Amino acid sequence: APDTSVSNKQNFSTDVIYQIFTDRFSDGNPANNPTGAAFDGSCTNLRLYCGGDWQGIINKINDGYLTGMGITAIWISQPVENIYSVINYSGVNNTAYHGYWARDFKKTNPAYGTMQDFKNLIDTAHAHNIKVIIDFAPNHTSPASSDDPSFAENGRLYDNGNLLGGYTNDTQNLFHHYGGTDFSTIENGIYKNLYDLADLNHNNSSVDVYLKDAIKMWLDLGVDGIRVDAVKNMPFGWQKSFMATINNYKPVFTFGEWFLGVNEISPEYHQFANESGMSLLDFRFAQKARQVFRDNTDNMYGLKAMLEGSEVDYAQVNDQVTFIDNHDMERFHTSNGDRRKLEQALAFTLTSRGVPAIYYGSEQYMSGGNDPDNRARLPSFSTTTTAYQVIQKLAPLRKSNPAIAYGSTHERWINNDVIIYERKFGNNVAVVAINRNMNTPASITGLVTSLPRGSYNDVLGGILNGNTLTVGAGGAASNFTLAPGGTAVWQYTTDATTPIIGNVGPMMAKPGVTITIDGRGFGSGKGTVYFGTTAVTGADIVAWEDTQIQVKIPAVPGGIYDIRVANAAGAASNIYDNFEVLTGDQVTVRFVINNATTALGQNVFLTGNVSELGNWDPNNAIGPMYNQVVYQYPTWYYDVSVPAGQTIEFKFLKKQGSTVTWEGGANRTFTTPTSGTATVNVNWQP
Amino acid sequence: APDTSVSNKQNFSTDVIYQIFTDRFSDGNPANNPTGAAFDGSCTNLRLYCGGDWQGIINKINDGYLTGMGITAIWISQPVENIYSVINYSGVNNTAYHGYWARDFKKTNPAYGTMQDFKNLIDTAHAHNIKVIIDFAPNHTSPASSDDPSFAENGRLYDNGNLLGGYTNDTQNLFHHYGGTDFSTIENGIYKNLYDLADLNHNNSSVDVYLKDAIKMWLDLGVDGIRVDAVKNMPFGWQKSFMATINNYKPVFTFGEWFLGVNEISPEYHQFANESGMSLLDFRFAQKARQVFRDNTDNMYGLKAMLEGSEVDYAQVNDQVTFIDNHDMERFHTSNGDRRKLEQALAFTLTSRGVPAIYYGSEQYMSGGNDPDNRARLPSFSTTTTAYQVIQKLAPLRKSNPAIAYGSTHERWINNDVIIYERKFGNNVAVVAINRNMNTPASITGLVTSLPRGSYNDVLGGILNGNTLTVGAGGAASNFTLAPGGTAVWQYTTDATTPIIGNVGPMMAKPGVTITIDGRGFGSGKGTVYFGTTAVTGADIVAWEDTQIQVKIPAVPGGIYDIRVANAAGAASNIYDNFEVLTGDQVTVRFVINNATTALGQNVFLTGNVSELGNWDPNNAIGPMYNQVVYQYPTWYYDVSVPAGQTIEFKFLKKQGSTVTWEGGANRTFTTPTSGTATVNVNWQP
Ligand SMILES: C[C@H]1O[C@H](O[C@H]2[C@H](O)[C@@H](O)[C@@H](O[C@H]3[C@H](O)[C@@H](O)[C@H](O)O[C@@H]3CO)O[C@@H]2CO)[C@H](O)[C@@H](O)[C@@H]1N[C@H]1C=C(CO)[C@@H](O)[C@H](O)[C@H]1O
Ligand SMILES: C[C@H]1O[C@H](O[C@H]2[C@H](O)[C@@H](O)[C@@H](O[C@H]3[C@H](O)[C@@H](O)[C@H](O)O[C@@H]3CO)O[C@@H]2CO)[C@H](O)[C@@H](O)[C@@H]1N[C@H]1C=C(CO)[C@@H](O)[C@H](O)[C@H]1O
Ligand SMILES: C[C@H]1O[C@H](O[C@H]2[C@H](O)[C@@H](O)[C@@H](O[C@H]3[C@H](O)[C@@H](O)[C@H](O)O[C@@H]3CO)O[C@@H]2CO)[C@H](O)[C@@H](O)[C@@H]1N[C@H]1C=C(CO)[C@@H](O)[C@H](O)[C@H]1O
Ligand SMILES: [Ca+2]
Ligand SMILES: [Ca+2]
Ligand SMILES: [Ca+2]
Ligand SMILES: [Ca+2]
Helix, strand or coil: CCCCCCCCCCCCCCCCEEEECHHHCCCCCHHHCCCHHHECCCCCCCCCECCCCHHHHHHHHHCCCCHHHCCCEEEECCCEEECCCCEEECCEEECCCCCCCEEEEEEECCCCCCHHHHHHHHHHHHHCCCEEEEEECCCEEEECCCCCCCCCCCCCEEECCEEEECCCCCCCCCECCCCECCCCCHHHHHHCECCCEEEECCCCHHHHHHHHHHHHHHHHCCCCEEEECCHHHCCHHHHHHHHHHHHHHCCCEEEECCCCCCCCCCHHHHHHHHHCCCEEECHHHHHHHHHHHCCCCCCHHHHHHHHHHHHHHCCCHHHCEECCCCCCCCCCCCCCCCHHHHHHHHHHHHHCCCEEEEECCHHHCCCCCCCCCCCCCCCCCCCCCHHHHHHHHHCCHHHHCHHHHHCEEEEEEECCCEEEEEEEECCEEEEEEEECCCCCCEEECCCECCCCCEEECCCCCCCCCCCCEEECHHHEECCEEECCCCEEEEEECCCCCCCEEEEEECCEECCCCEEEEEEECCCCCCCEEEECCEEECHHHEEEEECCEEEEECCCCCCEEEEEEEECCCCCECCCEEEEEECCCCEEEEEEEEECCCCCCCCEEEEEECCHHHCCCCHHHCECCCECCCCCCCCCEEEEEEEECCCEEEEEEEEEECCEEEECCCCCEEEECCCCCEEEEEEECCC | CCCCCCCCCCCCCCCCEEEECHHHCCCCCHHHCCCCCCECCCCCCCCCECCCCHHHHHHHHHCCHHHHCCCCEEEECCCEEECCCCECCCCCCECCCCCCCEEEEEEECCCCCCHHHHHHHHHHHHHCCCEEEEEECCCEEEECCCCCCCCCCCCCEEECCEEEECCCCCCCCCECCCCECCCCCHHHHHHCECCCEEEECCCCHHHHHHHHHHHHHHHHCCCCEEEECCHHHCCHHHHHHHHHHHHHHCCCEEEECCCCCCCCCCHHHHHHHHHCCCEEECHHHHHHHHHHHHHCCCCHHHHHHHHHHHHHHCCCHHHCEECCCCCCCCCCCCCCCCHHHHHHHHHHHHHCCCEEEEECCHHHCCCCCCCCHHHCCCCCCCCCCHHHHHHHHHCCHHHHCHHHHHCEEEEEEEECCEEEEEEEECCEEEEEEEECCCCCCEEECCCECCCCCEEECCCCCCCCCCCCEEECHHHEECCEEECCCCEEEEEECCCCCCCEEEEEECCEECCCCEEEEEEECCCCCCCEEEECCEEECHHHEEEEECCEEEEECCCCCCEEEEEEEECCCCCECCCEEEEEECCCCEEEEEEEEECCCCCCCCEEEEEECCHHHHHHCHHHCECCCECCCCCCCCCEEEEEEEECCCEEEEEEEEEECCEEEECCCCCEEEECCCCCCEEEEEECCC
């Protein structure tokens, strides 16, 4: 089918996402509204339920509010049954309106709707070519105190009605009981509790398989994307087996939230987008967009350096979800901030690389500080605001112009307040110029672009003071003055003769899984797909057409591969690297090693004979291991995704700068379980 | 040996060439100086012999003038025996001092020296790590009038003293007798005479074989490169069979002169570079450099556009020879003009991509107009000029820092008067910042770089008012003020672990010849070289070390191939593409089709079953064929290089944009000659 079908659950860079807090969007059904102290239909107390639901979203798809805007993906609040208690916190009553305090991951939150109401949402979203992404927060259940079993619902977890257990009297260790995080360390934030949320224990096999059974249930019900919550606060090894579970079952675009501060460039964050099997919410993009476009704490050079840098650091930059604000940040639009700032910042995000996500109500210039003030009910469904209009005009360019969906970003002109950048994919190009200065016009002299000769009309129709572009000989454009606050988008589209790959999804799966390669120039005749130098042709290509091919991963050795396409005429595409073929189905195993004594700067790592363990290469070893919380030094521990039901060989080692110290002895061996969890507890062999 | 060795004849990106007009450099042997009419020892008359010779260049390698400047290659006037005539042109006497009026391509010009002095030049140069590039001028012989046999030497051509023929009464048709070129079309500039020069006819098997035998004997005297003259004015197809003759016998770096004027961009120019097997003097670069640093008829965004654009248009940009002036244009330094512009532009060229050439005497701020004023004798052998010191500081960096020699160019900061660009290859980095404004200081803010945090000396030692750079977190540099006329070079080197290809020479050749791949990170142990999915290893990798491997071209089908290296440890490199494997040795065949009547913009083309003929792909067919000078429309003719000694199958087609009207009938067949030429003459088949 084409790369732009609503059935393409694997790649979303042709989409624009509208992030909906279900409770604050629309109350389509008042008979499902909570009662008593859990409810506030005036929505003046923002920690209470206001009554918004799935029928209210079906209604704004149907009446065209969402479709009118060009929105093609909806990201909604976690669908799962939540705790019913009203919790008092320092006098303030609080409810589970946000969907984040779960108790049964196999049932719906009935304030949102029934199971039949979720199905009706998927079906009318799909009938209108909209994809449905759900939040999923497998890190925890609900507010709990083991000391006080009567507080809230004591973190209790049920499997489709059947109690599994609570936080007080956790004889099964379904939950972590280490106290709360102080956020000092990644380890500390993983194993300790977030605030007061009862931390699930993913190393318990019942928690492991129930959470994996539950996500399969939501995939069976037709969801197309998953935003997983607090990715920083779960074991990365467990997350990779969770990701292999959805990728080997029904791969859908999955991305996670790892929060990043203002000028924080974090290595682990990038490693996580590059290696977990899910992409990330692009906080680096988001924080620099607000520094340049909102707060003027950085300029266009900062903007350029971030777009250039991120194209290298994320192995698949076209998979990162970009945004200018969301539910954890103060709204972009301030009380005294010019609306042009919001409008340009949205235009930027809509024509930039990635998968743009728009927080509900941006188009209605909502302002408000941090939680809960950034989650007010949206004030109006006016369809004629300037912001509604810039998204209406630009969001469809992601489906029609493959340069916006998949192209590289080239800065063609710049100064402190102006950047004009070019997105290019094959022969398709889009050019956008923006002048963030609202007093001073900009004299553009010497712009050259890849546009063929012509007089390009600004796709924004002049609503942000854009203009026509007259491109002469050799893509050189005639000089113009960009208006103060001006933003213009100029574009050109054509057929590609060369295969050009713009995106592949999933990026990690075992042999036999159908991968989806999207781009242009594949031609209509079944060509060749290369995993390294292995070639799939014929029947292993389950589907071929100019924009999309679907093909089964061949039975190659686990490891990571470059993908390449050849059309039926033998012309070959660009290389799409970092594809991970897995040795098979995964299981997460805890590795505990006692008496691994280390000097300062020395850490224990794990390596082994399968690609998941680095294939005996010390540079690709699993680690640094942890040694503070679940076990303390010199015991080190780590949860590592590993091939299920196989005997693997492995050894530990210590690394200090360039020096590697392997443990002596023979190779340790271990037969992994087929499902669940396992722990290997061993002692340093000198 | 390593990439930077003086024995690397295939690639020159690590070199700095010094273009010497042999006659105007140094007279080291007066006894071989011309007498009386052909000579002027005061060299007051720039059209007569002044005396400069190969012995004088040997003295300048020996006494330290050239090696002290960091020059690593020398390009000298054509070595070949020229006519002895003093020609009159308007009562202005004129001699062959420039070496361009050949008589015999197998003897030396006695004013320069003997074959014995030419061996001494090769040997003193190599002994001092300087490569020797000779001009070769195969388009023509010398001024000739067929009407008047006594003018000059009637363009007579000798074969090692044995007369072959003169222009008057050329019965064995050695020359073209179509009149002179008005430069109206490429076809007209090729087959008609350039000025009064008896134009050689490459379709004559005698001239085709003699010219190839002569180039081979200078490859046999140990020349390291060849600048071939007037590449525009000879048939592509013949120059390709000539390139295949050099590359299948003793590959050395060869590049042509295809003159190009200001703001001029020819597609045929970039097609020649990309498809001939030779590269080109980079007139695109040189013309924009003079506009920005000499003449002020463009600014930094223009420079920026040229750098960005040449990087995608030139398939192998690292092989283009750059310069800011030469013998066919006015010298860059203007009389009583600002020296700092010369110094700045010299520093610009020295740190930019390609292979830089310096016109002799630039370091002595030689002024002069067009021919012959730009070839006055070098007036000083001063080693302390700032232009001398600038070349001495920066020329070495092309051997030491691979970012300068092979790296990509990326603008990092810019405005009308300032560019700071960064060269990047692996983690080796060079950042050069130039302020062409000689009056205004520039404040740089927002410079983000790829250098590690630290403070960086200007390698020019501040002689061009450059400064010390301090780099903080994430490559962001501290605010600074680039002086008026400030030029500053800051750099970072570190060993590459993983293999990176920076250059490949030759780029076109039959199976069995040894190519040179240069870069970093290849390691000390043989790994694999791919030509397509064809892995080449062991005995065929003739040599392998970290910066250079040499390997024999596999017995693959004729076609263009991507080259990729995987070091012993399996880490694979970037792809170097557009490599052409010839089906075999080459002969230029003239194809002539009669009665091929076309429509509006319908052109005739040739295609056949070898890769040389596009392998039956209409989108790759040879053409559009010619039809004015040698044969007239509706007869079309084209000189195509084809594999020697086999039955090619061909057909002709007409292309109306995307319509291909094919000949009917059956596929034609012809057995090519093994050496020499042939002409196939046929009529359109409906
Ligand atoms: C449960 C919580 O989940 C999401 O936020 C995550 C982040 O994705 C995760 O990376 C981490 O980020 C925090 C960051 O480390 C810290 O420096 C910054 O100051 O705050 C970030 C956000 O809290 O932590 C949280 C996981 O705890 C959602 O985006 C959050 O909205 C969501 N919040 C819940 C939790 C509480 C209390 O149970 C409610 O007050 C809140 O309304 C609800 O949304
Ligand atoms: C004497 C020596 O004994 C063990 O040797 C190591 C290798 O040195 C190391 O490269 C590693 O190689 C992997 C191998 O490439 C792979 O094919 C195989 O299947 O798996 C290996 C890793 O499991 O492993 C081998 C052993 O299999 C020790 O591990 C070495 O450290 C040891 N050398 C040092 C270190 C210590 C250990 O504390 C001393 O006991 C020893 O005397 C000293 O020589
Ligand atoms: C033999 C001659 O060849 C080289 O220079 C040539 C170019 O190869 C050729 O393309 C042509 O360039 C002109 C270009 O094609 C045209 O479109 C442009 O507008 O103008 C260009 C010239 O201004 O002509 C040049 C030379 O004009 C060498 O680089 C030359 O040095 C070389 N010169 C010889 C030839 C003559 C004629 O007998 C002497 O006057 C001259 O001194 C001598 O050096
Ligand atoms: Ca409701
Ligand atoms: Ca956790
Ligand atoms: Ca002499
Ligand atoms: Ca010619």
